[PDB]
Design a protein around this ligand. Structure first.
Ligand SMILES: CCCCCCCCCCCCCCCCC(=O)O
Length: 133
């Protein structure tokens, strides 16, 4: 039920990503490069399994998961977390847990754009991705 999220997407706007990274304890030099990086996110499905690739000139990541089933993840900033992804209100909600901390990565489609909202602590970052053909 994930289907309009599938495809290749490019970052075209970012708000408050430095705040989000700093909340996670990312160091200034990494935040600095990250603030100038425009990733490509690729979301594909094969049956019940989603694979989400994030590619850039700085960091790359890839995760595979089934909706609603917890998976181990090692994030771009090297946190080892317990993750689960679901659909909630038509939004793809990714919850990460570690050390009693939590962060959510929420994706929603608004006027054909994918809006990624990243929340940790009080920090709320909004990143906008546009679909590639
Ligand atoms: C893999 C490319 C991610 C962007 C540059 C590196 C950022 C480091 C801080 C990582 C924080 C947790 C992941 C954020 C993902 C942001 C996104 O998918 O747009």
């Amino acid at each position: 039920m994930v289907d309009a999220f599938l495809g290749t997407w490019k970052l075209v706007d970012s708000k408050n990503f430095d705040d989000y990274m700093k909340s996670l304890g990312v160091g200034f030099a990494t935040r600095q490069v990250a603030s100038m990086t425009k990733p490509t996110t690729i979301i594909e499905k094969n049956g019940d399994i989603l694979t989400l690739k994030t590619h850039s000139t700085f960091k790359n990541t890839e995760i595979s998961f089934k909706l609603g089933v917890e998976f181990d993840e090692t994030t771009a900033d090297d946190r080892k977390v317990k993750s689960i992804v679901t659909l909630d209100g038509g939004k793809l909600v990714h919850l990460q847990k570690w050390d009693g901390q939590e962060t959510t990565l929420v994706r929603e489609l608004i006027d054909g754009k994918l809006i990624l909202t990243l929340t940790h602590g009080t920090a709320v970052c909004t990143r906008t991705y546009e679909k590639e053909a």
